[PDB]
Subunit: 46 residues, 3 copies
């Protein structure tokens, strides 16, 4: 059915949008974790 297929496609797109947003969030987080790991290292913790 044409109408339901169309709606499904729209939902898929919105989900791909949320996945984009999520991947960015994870990348920023991993950058922050590296930054922290490195400063923890430089301040001589262990």
């Amino acid at each position: 059915s044409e109408r339901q297929i169309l709606r499904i496609k729209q939902n898929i797109n919105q989900i791909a949008t949320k996945i984009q947003h999520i991947e960015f969030s994870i990348s920023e987080i991993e950058q922050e974790i590296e930054r922290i790991n490195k400063l923890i290292k430089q301040n001589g913790l262990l």
Copy 2:
């Protein structure tokens, strides 16, 4: 082809639920990191 349509819609719900949990875990992580940054600043560590 209604049953295959329903099958797909079910998968979409299942995915959205997964996205939800994921977003929440991210929330918690971001707050933990904010906390760690705070205590880092407070103890006057160099770098950043």
Copy 3:
């Protein structure tokens, strides 16, 4: 509607596969944060 339904299902699988990679990324971040909290603790910060 057949080729369209099949492509939709293809996209569903690619999304499911991405979500799996994202969960693994989150698990790794959570372990690194656990480790960071350990080191901060051992060093008597704050």
